[PDB]
Design a protein around this nucleic acid. Structure first.
Lengths: 51, 121, 60, 59, 51, 143, 228
RNA sequence: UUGAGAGAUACAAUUUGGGAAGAAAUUCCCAGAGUGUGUUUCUUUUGCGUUUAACCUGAACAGUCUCAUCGUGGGCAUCUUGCGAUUC
């Protein structure tokens, strides 16, 4: 779907970059980011299997 | 049913329903869904034979919930009229439970079937 | 004498040294594992070899 | 397996006949049953050796 | 937890005090239990409240 | 039937106390614990005292293998003898329940086989060559 | 009255009484996550049942470097009904957060109920087979845990090894031979699965075979090297 | 009294590491190994002989009528003295 909007896309080596990208979330920062991450997980599962 | 899990084939079902028909001759076999639920809690159950075409299927799905806790094997033979006739009872039986008796003459033939049921798990 | 040194070479060839209640093995070298497919297991290939070289067919 | 164990089933109604066989209908361990092709007779074996013969009086 | 119990223990789910008295001393088990106040057991009469 | 409830109930007294009894109790473990070491000469110079940085007794026991740096029962009365006796008895109690229950199940198994002789069906009196008596009911669909 | 002892692993403790017992502090009192008992000595302390949790048997089996710490974060595969992650949540304390992954629903509902009582436990109801299905929720966890019963168990960790491991971070792998072969000795399995992990940059340090708790199981300890 | 391989254990000679105690030698404690013998275990190769064996099943207990269960009477204590089990 990223290959549909007139720009190239590539993969298969960005995992080390995604590691540094996931390390960058601590750089932009950290605990309050996890609390936003918590209710994200708490809603995305409870929507799926429950209610 | 798609809710059916491990469901034996055409082949192993003939082996399972032969042992059922030989355990009902030794009277080693508790019959029905509400009695196979008993032998799990007492722990004297060897394994659990269940039917697949029971309508509704949800009335015997607690036995795969119960057997996963107590580590007792279970399969689904496909049809409840079959397991009824192989159990010695005129009514259709949707879940049958082989009890544990180590003095039994059929003890060897149970553990041959039991290993094939744990093979599917 | 001649065979007594071969048995001590097994005390060089071995890698799994037991320490009482414990044991210690070693990781092999990576290039010996990567550049070579792992070795044929005996309990499978003897089942092939005994079966074709069977007394019930009069071979040889 | 059991003595006196022949049962007749009517067709297409799938109703077992109720009057015959009675209790006092001598059969024995029925091992060999046979119908006539033509006259409507019925021959029932046993284990004792006695082939006891009936007649379906409709036919 | 209730559906994992069999059928015959949903009779005597209430009357547990008179049950284990009647098993530990050899006696007769209670036959209704908490199910007795259903609208349908009361519609029956006699021994048919048991059946 | 009343006999095969009172034995059946006292078995479940003894079996549910088997689970409550084993839940408090602690079993020392005896399993294989192999250590993977990169070089054969590090392997030959291995010592459990050095690798786990423990000392004499803290090598062999697996519940608490503490660091010598981490190092840097008499509050309970009589720790050598009385406490270790009362350490042992909690096993020997639940050792007895397991000996009580399996003895008590066989009272049911020989009672339940006696109770199933009365009902219906045609039974065959067989005796094994060992001398034990079991029965074999006839292949007959009960109605 | 009850002697309490620090375990060599931080957060873990061992209580001494008439009967010995392995124990852990709780974050929230007044709750039994699976109906276990607890001791309150004041500070609450909660038993681990080693026959129900393989990590509980892994500690008490005698294990050198469990990478789970208080300050660290730890990802968890195979969080079926949350019997062990509430021990993992209670050994990381408030500071470490635990990522619990599960694919099955009916025991997953207990984990949904358990996140409401624990701040560390967050659930992952997505499939552990495809880790990019939940890539956004987790980033750079320190060490992971395996309890999955799938036969591609070196495969499913390897796709969680590349994407979510902190580099030079540990790994804990629990393997049964009953999953994989059930025909050869369980020792013969463990040589096969260790060689699988060296193909995915995991250098295994130790393995411990739980003999008196579960039959023919294992725990495998390694360090994920030179990849993030 | 085949070939080899591995494991356990008993024994003796002998060593590793760790801890304290002694100026060193030395001392004790704890953990661990290999070697020589005895023993024992399972797996494997080969030689000779053998080609079926074991279990199950079909109308497989019963006219000297069989079995079950509850009781009664007697024996066996110079002891089947009798388990909610089956002493005859």
């Amino acid at each position: 779907x990223x290959x549909x909007x007139x720009x190239x896309x590539x993969x298969x080596x960005x995992x080390x970059x995604x590691x540094x990208x996931x390390x960058x979330x601590x750089x932009x920062x950290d605990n309050d980011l996890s609390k936003m991450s918590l209710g994200l997980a708490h809603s995305i599962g409870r929507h799926k299997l429950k209610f | 049913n798609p809710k059916a899990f491990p469901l034996a084939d055409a082949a192993l079902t003939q082996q399972i329903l032969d042992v059922v028909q030989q355990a009902a001759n030794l009277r080693q076999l508790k019959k029905g869904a509400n009695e196979a639920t008993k032998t799990l809690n007492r722990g004297i159950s060897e394994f659990i034979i269940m039917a697949a075409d029971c309508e509704p299927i949800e009335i015997l799905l607690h036995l795969p919930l119960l057997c996963e806790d107590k580590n007792v094997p279970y399969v689904f033979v496909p049809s409840r009229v079959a397991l009824g006739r192989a159990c010695g009872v005129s009514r259709p039986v949707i879940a049958a439970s082989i009890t544990t008796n180590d003095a039994s003459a059929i003890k060897t033939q149970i553990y041959a079937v039991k290993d094939k049921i744990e093979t599917l798990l | 004498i001649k065979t007594k040194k071969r048995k001590t070479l097994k005390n060089l060839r071995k890698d799994s040294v037991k320490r009482g209640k414990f044991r210690v093995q070693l990781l092999s070298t990576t290039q010996d594992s990567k550049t070579l497919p792992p070795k044929k297991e005996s309990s499978i290939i003897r089942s092939k070899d005994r079966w074709l070289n069977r007394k019930a067919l009069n071979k040889g | 397996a059991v003595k006196d164990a022949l049962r007749l089933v009517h067709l297409p109604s799938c109703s077992v006949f109720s009057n015959w066989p009675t209790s006092g209908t001598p059969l024995g361990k029925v091992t060999s049953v046979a119908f006539s092709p033509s006259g409507g007779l019925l021959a029932v074996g046993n284990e004792q050796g006695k082939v006891r013969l009936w007649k379906l009086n409709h036919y | 937890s209730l559906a994992k119990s069999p059928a015959s223990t949903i009779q005597i789910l209430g009357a547990e005090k008179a049950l284990f008295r009647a098993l530990k001393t050899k006696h007769d088990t209670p036959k209704y239990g908490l199910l007795y106040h259903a609208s349908l057991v009361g519609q029956a009469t006699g021994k048919n409240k048991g059946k | 039937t009343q006999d095969s409830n009172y034995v059946r109930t006292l078995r479940q007294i003894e079996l549910k106390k088997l689970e409550k009894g084993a839940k408090q109790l602690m079993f020392k473990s005896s399993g294989n614990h192999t250590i993977f070491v990169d070089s054969r000469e590090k392997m030959n110079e291995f010592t459990p005292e050095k690798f786990f940085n423990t000392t004499s007794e803290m090598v062999n026991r697996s519940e608490n293998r503490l660091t010598k740096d981490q190092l840097a029962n008499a509050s309970s009365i009589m720790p050598k003898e009385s406490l270790d006796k009362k350490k042992l008895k909690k096993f020997k109690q639940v050792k007895q329940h397991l000996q009580r229950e399996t003895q008590l199940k066989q009272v049911q198994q020989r009672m339940d086989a006696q109770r199933e002789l009365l009902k219906k069906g045609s039974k065959k009196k067989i005796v094994d060559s060992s001398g034990k008596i079991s029965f074999k009911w006839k292949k007959q669909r009960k109605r | 009255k009850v002697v309490i002892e620090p375990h060599r692993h931080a957060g873990v403790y061992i209580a001494r009484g008439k009967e010995d017992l392995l124990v852990t502090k709780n974050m929230a009192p007044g709750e039994s996550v699976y109906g276990e008992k607890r001791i309150s000595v004041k500070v609450e302390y909660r038993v681990w049942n080693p026959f129900r949790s393989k990590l509980a048997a892994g500690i008490m089996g005698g294990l050198d470097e469990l990478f789970i710490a208080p300050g660290k974060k730890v990802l968890y595969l195979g969080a079926a009904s949350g019997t062990s992650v509430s021990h993992v949540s209670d050994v990381v304390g408030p500071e470490g957060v635990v990522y619990a992954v599960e694919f099955s629903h009916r025991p997953g509902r207990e984990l949904i109920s358990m996140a409401k009582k624990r701040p560390n436990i967050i659930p992952i109801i997505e499939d552990a087979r495809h880790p990019q299905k939940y890539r956004m929720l987790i980033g750079m966890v320190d060490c992971v845990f395996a309890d999955v019963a799938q036969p591609d168990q070196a495969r499913i960790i390897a796709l969680n090894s590349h994407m979510f491991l902190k580099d030079q971070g540990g790994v804990v792998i629990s393997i049964k031979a009953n999953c994989i072969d059930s025909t050869v000795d369980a020792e013969t399995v463990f040589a096969r699965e260790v060689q699988k992990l060296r193909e995915e940059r995991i250098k295994p340090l130790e393995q411990l075979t739980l003999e008196p708790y579960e039959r023919d199981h294992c725990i495998v300890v390694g360090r994920y090297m030179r990849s993030g």
